[PDB]
Coordinates of C-alpha atoms and ligand atoms in Angstrom, one line a residue:
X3 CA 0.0 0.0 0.0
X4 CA 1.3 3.3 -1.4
X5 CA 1.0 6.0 1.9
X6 CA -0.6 9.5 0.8
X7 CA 1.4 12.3 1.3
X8 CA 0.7 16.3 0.7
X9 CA 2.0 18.5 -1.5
X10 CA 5.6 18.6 -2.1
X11 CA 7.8 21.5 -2.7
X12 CA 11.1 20.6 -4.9
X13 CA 14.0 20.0 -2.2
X14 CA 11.9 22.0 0.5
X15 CA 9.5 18.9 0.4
X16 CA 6.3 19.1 2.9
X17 CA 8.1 21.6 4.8
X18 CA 6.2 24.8 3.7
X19 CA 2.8 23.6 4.3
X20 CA 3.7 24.0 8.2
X21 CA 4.8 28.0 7.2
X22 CA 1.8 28.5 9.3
X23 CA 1.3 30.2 13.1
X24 CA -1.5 26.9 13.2
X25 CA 0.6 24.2 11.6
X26 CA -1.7 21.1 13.6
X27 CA -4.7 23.0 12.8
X28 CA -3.6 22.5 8.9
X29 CA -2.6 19.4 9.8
X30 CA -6.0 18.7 10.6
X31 CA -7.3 19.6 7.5
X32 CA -4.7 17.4 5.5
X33 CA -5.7 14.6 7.7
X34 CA -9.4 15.4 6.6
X35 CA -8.2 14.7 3.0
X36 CA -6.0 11.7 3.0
X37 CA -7.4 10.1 5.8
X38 CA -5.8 8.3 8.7
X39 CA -2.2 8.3 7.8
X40 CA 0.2 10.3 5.9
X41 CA 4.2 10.6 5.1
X42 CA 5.0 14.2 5.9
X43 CA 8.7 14.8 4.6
X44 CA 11.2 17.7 5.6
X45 CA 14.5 18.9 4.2
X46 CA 16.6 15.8 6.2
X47 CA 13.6 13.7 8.0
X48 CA 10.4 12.6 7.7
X49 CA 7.6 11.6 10.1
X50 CA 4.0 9.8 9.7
X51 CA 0.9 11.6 11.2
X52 CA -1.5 8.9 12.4
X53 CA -5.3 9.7 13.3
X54 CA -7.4 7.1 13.5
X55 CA -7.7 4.7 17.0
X56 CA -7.0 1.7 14.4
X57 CA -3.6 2.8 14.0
X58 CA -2.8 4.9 16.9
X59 CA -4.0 1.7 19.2
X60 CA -0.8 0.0 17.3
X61 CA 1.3 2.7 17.7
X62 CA 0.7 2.6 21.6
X63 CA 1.8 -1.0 22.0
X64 CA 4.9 -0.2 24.0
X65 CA 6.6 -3.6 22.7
X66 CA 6.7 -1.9 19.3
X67 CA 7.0 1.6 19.6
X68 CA 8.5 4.2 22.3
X69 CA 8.6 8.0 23.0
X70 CA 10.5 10.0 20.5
X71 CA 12.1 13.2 21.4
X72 CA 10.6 16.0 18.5
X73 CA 12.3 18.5 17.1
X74 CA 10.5 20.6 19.4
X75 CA 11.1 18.5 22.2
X76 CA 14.6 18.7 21.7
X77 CA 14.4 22.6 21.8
X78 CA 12.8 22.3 25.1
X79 CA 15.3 20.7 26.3
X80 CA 17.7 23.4 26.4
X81 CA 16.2 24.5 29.7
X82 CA 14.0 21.4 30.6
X83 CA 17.1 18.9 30.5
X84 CA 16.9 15.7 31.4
X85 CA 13.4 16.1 33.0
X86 CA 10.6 13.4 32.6
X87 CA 9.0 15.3 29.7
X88 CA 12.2 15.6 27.7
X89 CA 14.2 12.9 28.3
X90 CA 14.3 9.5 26.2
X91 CA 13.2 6.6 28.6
X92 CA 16.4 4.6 27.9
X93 CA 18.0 8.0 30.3
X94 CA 18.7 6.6 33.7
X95 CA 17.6 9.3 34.9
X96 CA 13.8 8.7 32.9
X97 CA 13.2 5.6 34.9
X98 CA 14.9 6.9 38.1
X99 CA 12.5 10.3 37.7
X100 CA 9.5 8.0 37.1
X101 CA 9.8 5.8 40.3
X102 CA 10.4 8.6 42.6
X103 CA 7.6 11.2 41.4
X104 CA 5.1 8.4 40.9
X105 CA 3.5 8.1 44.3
X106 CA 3.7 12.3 44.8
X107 CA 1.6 12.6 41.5
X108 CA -1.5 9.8 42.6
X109 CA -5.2 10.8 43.7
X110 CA -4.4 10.0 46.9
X111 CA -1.4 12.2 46.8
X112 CA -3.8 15.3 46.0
X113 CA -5.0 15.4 49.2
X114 CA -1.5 17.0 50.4
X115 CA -1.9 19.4 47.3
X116 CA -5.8 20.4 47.9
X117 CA -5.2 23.6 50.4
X118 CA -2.6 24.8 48.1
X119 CA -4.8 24.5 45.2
X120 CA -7.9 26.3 47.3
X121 CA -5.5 28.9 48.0
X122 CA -4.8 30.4 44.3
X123 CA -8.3 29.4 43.0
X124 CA -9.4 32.0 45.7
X125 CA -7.2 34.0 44.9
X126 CA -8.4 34.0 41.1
X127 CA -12.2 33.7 43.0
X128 CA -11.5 36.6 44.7
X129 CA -10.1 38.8 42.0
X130 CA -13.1 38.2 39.6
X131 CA -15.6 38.9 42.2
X132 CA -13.4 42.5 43.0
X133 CA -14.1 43.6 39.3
X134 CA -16.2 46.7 38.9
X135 CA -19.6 46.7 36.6
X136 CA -17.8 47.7 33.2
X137 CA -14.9 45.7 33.2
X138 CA -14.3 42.1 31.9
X139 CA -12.1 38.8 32.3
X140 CA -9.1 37.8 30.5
X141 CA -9.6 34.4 30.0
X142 CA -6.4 32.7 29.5
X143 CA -4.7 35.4 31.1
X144 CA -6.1 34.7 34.1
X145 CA -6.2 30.8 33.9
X146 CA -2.5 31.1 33.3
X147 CA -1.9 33.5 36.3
X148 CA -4.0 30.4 38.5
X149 CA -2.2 27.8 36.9
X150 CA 1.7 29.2 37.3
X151 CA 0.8 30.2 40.7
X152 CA -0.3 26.6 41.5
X153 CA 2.4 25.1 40.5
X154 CA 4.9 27.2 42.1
X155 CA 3.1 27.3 45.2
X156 CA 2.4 23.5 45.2
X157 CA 6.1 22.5 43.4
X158 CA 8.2 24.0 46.0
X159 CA 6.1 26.4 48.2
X160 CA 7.3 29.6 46.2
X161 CA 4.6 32.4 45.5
X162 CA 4.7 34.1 42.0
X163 CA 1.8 36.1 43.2
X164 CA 0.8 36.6 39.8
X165 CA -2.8 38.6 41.2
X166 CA -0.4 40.8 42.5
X167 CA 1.1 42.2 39.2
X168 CA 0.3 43.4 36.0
X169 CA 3.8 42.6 34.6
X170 CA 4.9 38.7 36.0
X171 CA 7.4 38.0 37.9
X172 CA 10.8 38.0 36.3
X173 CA 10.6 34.1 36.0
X174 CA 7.4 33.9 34.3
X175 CA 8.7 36.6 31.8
X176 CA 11.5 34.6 30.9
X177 CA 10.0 31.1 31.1
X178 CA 7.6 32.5 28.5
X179 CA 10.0 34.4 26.5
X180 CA 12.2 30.7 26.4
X181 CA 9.4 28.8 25.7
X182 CA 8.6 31.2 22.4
X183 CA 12.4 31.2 21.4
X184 CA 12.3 27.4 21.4
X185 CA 8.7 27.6 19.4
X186 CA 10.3 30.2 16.9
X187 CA 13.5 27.4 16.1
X188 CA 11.0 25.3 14.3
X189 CA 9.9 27.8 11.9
X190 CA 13.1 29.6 11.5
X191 CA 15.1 29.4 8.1
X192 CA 18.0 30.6 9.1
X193 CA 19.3 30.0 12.1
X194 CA 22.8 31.3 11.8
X195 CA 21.7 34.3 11.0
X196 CA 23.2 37.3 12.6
X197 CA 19.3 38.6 13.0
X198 CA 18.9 35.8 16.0
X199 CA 22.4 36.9 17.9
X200 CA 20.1 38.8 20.4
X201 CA 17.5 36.0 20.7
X202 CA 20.1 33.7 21.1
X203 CA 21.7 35.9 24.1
X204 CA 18.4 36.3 25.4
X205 CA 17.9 32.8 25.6
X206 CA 20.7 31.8 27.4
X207 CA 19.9 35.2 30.0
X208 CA 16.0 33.4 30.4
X209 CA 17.6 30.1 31.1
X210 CA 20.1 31.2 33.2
X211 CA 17.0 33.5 35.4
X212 CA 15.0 30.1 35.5
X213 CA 17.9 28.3 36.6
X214 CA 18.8 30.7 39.3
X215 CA 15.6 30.9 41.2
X216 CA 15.5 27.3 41.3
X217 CA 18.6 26.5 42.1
X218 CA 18.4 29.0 45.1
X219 CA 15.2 27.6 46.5
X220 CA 16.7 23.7 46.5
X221 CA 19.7 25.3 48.4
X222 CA 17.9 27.1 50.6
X223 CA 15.7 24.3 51.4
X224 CA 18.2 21.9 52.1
X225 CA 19.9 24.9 54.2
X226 CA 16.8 25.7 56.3
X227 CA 15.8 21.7 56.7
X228 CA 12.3 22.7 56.1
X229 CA 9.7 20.1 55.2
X230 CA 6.7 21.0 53.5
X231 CA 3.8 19.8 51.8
X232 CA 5.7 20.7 48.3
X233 CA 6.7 18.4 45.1
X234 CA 10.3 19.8 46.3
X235 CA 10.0 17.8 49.6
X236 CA 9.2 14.8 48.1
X237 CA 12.3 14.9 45.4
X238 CA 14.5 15.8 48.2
X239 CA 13.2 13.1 50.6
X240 CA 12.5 10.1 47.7
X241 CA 15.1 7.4 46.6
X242 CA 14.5 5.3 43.5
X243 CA 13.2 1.7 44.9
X244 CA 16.0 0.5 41.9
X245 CA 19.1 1.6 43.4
X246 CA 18.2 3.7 46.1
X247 CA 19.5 7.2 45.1
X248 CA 17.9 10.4 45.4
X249 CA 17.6 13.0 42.6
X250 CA 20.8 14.8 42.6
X251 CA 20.0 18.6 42.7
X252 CA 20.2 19.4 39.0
X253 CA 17.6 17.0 38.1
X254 CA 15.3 18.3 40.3
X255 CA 15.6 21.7 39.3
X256 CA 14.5 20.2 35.8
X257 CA 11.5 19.0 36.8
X258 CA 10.5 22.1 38.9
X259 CA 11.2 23.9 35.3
X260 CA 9.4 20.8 33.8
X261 CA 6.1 21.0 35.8
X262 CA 6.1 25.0 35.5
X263 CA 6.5 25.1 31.6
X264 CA 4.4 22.1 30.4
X265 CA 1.4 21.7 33.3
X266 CA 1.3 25.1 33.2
X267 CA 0.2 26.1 29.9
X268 CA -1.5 22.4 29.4
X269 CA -4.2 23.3 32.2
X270 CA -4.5 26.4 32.0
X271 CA -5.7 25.7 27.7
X272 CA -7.7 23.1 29.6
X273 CA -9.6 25.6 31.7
X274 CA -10.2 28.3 29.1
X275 CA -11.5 25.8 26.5
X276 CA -13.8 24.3 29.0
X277 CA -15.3 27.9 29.9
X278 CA -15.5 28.7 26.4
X279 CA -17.2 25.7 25.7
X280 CA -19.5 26.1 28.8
X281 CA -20.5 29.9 27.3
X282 CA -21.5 28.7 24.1
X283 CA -23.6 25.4 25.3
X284 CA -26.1 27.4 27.5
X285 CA -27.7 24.4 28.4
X286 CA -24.5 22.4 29.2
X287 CA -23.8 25.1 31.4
X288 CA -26.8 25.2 32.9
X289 CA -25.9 21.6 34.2
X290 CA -22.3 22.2 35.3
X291 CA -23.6 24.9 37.8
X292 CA -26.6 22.7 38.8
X293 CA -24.0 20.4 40.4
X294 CA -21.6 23.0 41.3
X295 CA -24.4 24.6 43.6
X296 CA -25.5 21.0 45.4
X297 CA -22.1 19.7 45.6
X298 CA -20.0 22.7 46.9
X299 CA -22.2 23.3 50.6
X300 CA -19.0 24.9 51.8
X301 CA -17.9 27.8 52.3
X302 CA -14.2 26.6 50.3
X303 CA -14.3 23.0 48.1
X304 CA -13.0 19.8 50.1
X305 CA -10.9 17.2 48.6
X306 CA -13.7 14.8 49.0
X307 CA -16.3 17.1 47.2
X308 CA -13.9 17.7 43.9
X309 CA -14.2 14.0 42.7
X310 CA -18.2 14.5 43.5
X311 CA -18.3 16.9 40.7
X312 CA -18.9 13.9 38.1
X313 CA -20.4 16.3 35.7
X314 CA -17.6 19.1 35.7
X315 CA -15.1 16.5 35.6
X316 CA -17.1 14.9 32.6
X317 CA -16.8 18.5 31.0
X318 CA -13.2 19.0 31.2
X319 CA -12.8 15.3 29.7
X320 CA -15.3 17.1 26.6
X321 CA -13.2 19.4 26.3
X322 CA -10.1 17.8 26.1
X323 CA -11.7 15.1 23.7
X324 CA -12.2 18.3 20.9
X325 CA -9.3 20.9 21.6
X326 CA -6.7 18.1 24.2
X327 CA -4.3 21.4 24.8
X328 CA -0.9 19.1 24.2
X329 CA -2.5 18.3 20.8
X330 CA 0.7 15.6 19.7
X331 CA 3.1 13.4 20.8
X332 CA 5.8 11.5 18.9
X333 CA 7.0 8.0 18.6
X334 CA 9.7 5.9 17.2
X335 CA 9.4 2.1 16.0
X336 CA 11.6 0.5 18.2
X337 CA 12.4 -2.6 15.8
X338 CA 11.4 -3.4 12.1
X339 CA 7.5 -3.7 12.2
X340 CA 4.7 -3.8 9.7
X341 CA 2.0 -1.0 10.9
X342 CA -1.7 -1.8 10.7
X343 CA -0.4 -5.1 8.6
X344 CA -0.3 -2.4 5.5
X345 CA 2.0 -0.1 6.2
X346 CA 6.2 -1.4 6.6
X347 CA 8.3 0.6 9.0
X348 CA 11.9 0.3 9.7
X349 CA 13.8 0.1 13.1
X350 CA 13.8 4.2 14.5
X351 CA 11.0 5.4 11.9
X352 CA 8.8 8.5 13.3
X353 CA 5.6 8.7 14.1
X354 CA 2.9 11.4 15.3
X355 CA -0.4 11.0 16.7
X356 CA -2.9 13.9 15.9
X357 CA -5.1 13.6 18.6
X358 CA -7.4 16.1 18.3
X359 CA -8.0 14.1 15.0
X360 CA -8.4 10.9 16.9
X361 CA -11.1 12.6 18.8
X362 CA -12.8 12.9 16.0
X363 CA -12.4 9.1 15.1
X364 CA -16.7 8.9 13.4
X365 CA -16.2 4.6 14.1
X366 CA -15.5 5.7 17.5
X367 CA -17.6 8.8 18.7
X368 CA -20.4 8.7 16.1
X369 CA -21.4 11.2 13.0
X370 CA -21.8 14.2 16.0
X371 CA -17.8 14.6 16.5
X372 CA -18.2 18.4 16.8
X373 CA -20.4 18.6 19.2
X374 CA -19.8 19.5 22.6
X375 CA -21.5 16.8 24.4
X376 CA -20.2 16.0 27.7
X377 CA -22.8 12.9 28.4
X378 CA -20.0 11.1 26.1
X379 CA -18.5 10.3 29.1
X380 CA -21.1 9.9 31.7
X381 CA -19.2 5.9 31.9
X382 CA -16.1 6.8 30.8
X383 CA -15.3 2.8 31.3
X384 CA -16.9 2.3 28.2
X385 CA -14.8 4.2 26.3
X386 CA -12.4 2.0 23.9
X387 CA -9.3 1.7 24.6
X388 CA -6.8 4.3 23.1
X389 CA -10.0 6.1 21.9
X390 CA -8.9 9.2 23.9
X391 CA -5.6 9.7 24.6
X392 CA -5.5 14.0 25.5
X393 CA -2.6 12.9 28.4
X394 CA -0.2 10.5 25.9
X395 CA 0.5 6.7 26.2
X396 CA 1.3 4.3 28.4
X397 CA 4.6 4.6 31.0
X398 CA 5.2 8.2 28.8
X399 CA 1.8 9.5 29.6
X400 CA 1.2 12.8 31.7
X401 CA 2.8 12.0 35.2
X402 CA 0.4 15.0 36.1
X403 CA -3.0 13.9 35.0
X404 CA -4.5 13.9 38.6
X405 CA -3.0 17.3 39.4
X406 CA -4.5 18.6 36.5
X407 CA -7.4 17.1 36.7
X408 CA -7.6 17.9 40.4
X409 CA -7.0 21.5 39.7
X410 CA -9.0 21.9 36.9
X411 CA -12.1 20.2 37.9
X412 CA -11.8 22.3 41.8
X413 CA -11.3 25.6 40.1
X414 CA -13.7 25.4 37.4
X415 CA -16.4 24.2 40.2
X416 CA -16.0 27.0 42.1
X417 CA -16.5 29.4 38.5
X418 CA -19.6 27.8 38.7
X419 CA -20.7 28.0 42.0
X420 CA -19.9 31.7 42.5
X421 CA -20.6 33.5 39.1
X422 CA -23.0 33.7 35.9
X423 CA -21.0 33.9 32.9
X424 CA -22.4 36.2 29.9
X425 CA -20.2 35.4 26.6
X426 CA -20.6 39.3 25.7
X427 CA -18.6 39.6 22.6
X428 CA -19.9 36.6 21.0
X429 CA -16.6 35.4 20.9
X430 CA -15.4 33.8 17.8
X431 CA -12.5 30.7 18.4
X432 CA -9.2 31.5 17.6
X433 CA -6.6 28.9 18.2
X434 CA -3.0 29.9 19.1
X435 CA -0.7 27.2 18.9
X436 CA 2.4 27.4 20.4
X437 CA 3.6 24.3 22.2
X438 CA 0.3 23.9 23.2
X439 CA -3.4 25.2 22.5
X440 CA -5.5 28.2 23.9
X441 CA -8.5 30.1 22.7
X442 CA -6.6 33.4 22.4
X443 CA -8.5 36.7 22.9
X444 CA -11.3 34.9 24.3
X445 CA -12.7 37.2 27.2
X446 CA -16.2 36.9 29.5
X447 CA -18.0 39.2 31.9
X448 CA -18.5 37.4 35.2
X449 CA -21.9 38.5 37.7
X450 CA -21.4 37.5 40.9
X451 CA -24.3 35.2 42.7
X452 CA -22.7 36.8 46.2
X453 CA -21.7 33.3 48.0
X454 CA -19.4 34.2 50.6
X455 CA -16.2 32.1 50.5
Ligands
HEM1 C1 -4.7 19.2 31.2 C2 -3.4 19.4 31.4 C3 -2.3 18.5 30.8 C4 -2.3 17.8 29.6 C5 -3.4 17.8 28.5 C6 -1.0 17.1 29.5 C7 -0.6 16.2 28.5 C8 0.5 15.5 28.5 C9 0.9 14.6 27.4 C10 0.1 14.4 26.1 C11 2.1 14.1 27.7 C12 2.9 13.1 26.9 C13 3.9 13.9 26.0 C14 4.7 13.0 25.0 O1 4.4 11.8 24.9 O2 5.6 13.6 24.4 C15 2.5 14.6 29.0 C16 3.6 14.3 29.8 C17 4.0 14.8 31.0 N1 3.3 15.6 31.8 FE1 1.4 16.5 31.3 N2 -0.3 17.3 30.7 C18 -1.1 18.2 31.5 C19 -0.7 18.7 32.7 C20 0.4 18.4 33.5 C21 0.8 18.9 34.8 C22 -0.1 19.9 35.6 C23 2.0 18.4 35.1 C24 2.9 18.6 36.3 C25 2.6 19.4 37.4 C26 2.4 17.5 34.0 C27 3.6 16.8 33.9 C28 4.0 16.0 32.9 C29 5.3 15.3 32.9 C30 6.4 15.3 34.0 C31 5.3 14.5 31.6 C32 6.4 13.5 31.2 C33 6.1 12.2 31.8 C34 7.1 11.1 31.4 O3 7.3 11.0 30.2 O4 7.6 10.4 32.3 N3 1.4 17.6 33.0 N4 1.5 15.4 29.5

């Protein structure tokens, strides 16, 4: 079987079809006209963009294919190192990683997190209930100040105190300005050019600011002998069941930076795409707040009462299904294998699964794909499996799935419970892609239902 592949340009090959600021959005629409597979060439490689669960079920058998390291990936990983989310698993330090953070990322282990979490999303809570009559809400603004602070607070008890500031704290500024740099690599021609000499100094300034701060609060921990309720504690404290070392401190600095630059942005896309969502499905909405009000009696959420909000949580897991905010991940054939008994693939051959074109697998989820219809999920048991995959595959998926999860489903219960939403500019989507997805621009008004917190 021949593989269908999109226009080629002479030696440039596929290269500048992705000349886009929404290169999986026109990926999207490739994968809408040659269907579930397709050979996508470059000047030097080549990768495969899978879409339907027939394929990408095959592509998540871990005896037959592993993570790869993108090219983006690999940018990244000038500041994220050898972190979980950048590193190949063969690393010692993957597995090592893995088997320490493991048991500080489970349900269970949320219950440590929980007051942290309350404490930002009152913060945000707070904030939006301060706003005078004229004024409106940044969405992804504002989900990105909750989200950053969250982390910080609940990766190693540091406060951004991003409600605090119209311009973010040095760290954010440069977090976000390297996390663009390593964006702009993929697109850029030329990267010798004498043009990028000052993004290239910049870069290595951001890194070293993100490195600093870091660096200084793991020292000063260890100095102070301090335990907290943090992720930092529990790196400091852990030892890898294997061999029975700790993290040494420069890997745990990685995965601070780690948590901070993916779970950040990852949730806080999560969180705007759900409100949007919620705004334009009135009666969907409608719903969400219905069990918002009878679940949350308190006057702030309890652990208990987050994982009672089925129908928020079911929400979320909508949203995900039609805009999952890390919208691909990467894999390599680890031997010579034959894919979906039609397609031959040798020994270290790419792969990329389009998942928000899985989600919209018709043999899976039916003709209504575009809908927003969170009963999809009401037994999410039922679901088959591989189906949705908006948190990766297998011993490489999302560490962080509960934390999100946790956070997201906790702060988007107490939206609900506190304040109507009016969608007052008739927003229209617009997807920035960056590493991840958001709903740029998108902005609400919020009316308080004046519930003390
Ligand atoms: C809704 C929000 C999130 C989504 C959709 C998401 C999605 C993903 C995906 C798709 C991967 C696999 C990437 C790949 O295969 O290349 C991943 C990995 C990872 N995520 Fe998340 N993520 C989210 C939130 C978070 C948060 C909040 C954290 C940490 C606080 C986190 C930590 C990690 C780590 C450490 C990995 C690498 C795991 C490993 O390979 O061992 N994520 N995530």
């Amino acid at each position: 079987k021949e593989m269908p592949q999109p226009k080629t340009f002479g030696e440039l090959k596929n290269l500048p079809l992705l000349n886009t600021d929404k290169p999986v959005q026109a990926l999207m629409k490739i994968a809408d006209e040659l269907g579930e597979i397709f050979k996508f060439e470059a000047p030097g490689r080549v990768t495969r963009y899978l879409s339907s669960q027939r394929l990408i079920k095959e592509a998540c058998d871990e005896s037959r294919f592993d993570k790869n390291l993108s090219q983006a990936l690999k940018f990244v990983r000038d500041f994220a190192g050898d972190g979980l989310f950048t590193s190949w698993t063969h690393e010692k330090n993957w597995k090592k990683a893995h088997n320490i953070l493991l048991p500080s990322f489970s349900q269970q282990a949320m219950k440590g997190y929980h007051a942290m979490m309350v404490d930002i999303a009152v913060q945000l809570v707070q904030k939006w209930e301060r706003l005078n009559a004229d004024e409106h809400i940044e969405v992804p603004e504002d989900m990105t100040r909750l989200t950053l602070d969250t982390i910080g607070l609940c990766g190693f008890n540091y406060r951004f105190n991003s409600f605090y500031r119209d311009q973010p704290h040095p760290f954010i500024t440069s977090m976000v300005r390297a996390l663009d740099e390593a964006m702009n690599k993929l697109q850029r021609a030329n990267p010798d050019d004498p043009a990028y000499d000052e993004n290239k100094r910049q870069f290595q300034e951001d890194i070293k600011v993100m490195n600093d701060l870091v660096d200084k609060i793991i020292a000063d921990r260890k100095a102070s002998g301090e335990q907290s309720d943090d992720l930092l504690t529990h790196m400091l404290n852990g030892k890898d069941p294997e061999t029975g070392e700790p993290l040494d401190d420069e890997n745990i600095r990685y995965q601070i930076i780690t948590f901070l630059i993916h779970g950040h942005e990852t949730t806080s896309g999560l969180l705007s795409f759900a409100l949007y969502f919620l705004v334009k499905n009135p009666h969907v909405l409608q719903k969400a707040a219905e069990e918002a009000a009878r679940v949350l009696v308190d006057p702030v959420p309890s652990y208990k009462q987050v994982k009672q909000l089925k129908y928020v949580g079911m929400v979320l897991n909508e949203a995900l299904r039609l805009w999952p905010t890390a919208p691909a991940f990467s894999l390599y054939a680890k031997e010579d294998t034959v894919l979906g008994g039609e397609y031959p693939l040798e020994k270290g051959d790419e792969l990329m699964v389009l998942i928000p074109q899985l989600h919209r697998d018709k043999t899976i989820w039916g003709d209504d794909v575009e809908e927003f219809r969170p009963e999809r999920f009401e037994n999410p048991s039922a679901i088959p499996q591989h189906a949705f995959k908006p948190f990766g595959n297998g011993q490489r998926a999302c560490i962080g799935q509960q934390f999100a999860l946790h956070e997201a489903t906790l702060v988007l219960g107490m939206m609900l419970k506190h304040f109507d939403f009016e969608d007052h500019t008739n927003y229209e989507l617009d997807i920035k892609e960056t590493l991840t997805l958001k709903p740029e621009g998108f902005v609400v008004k919020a009316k308080s239902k004046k519930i003390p917190l």
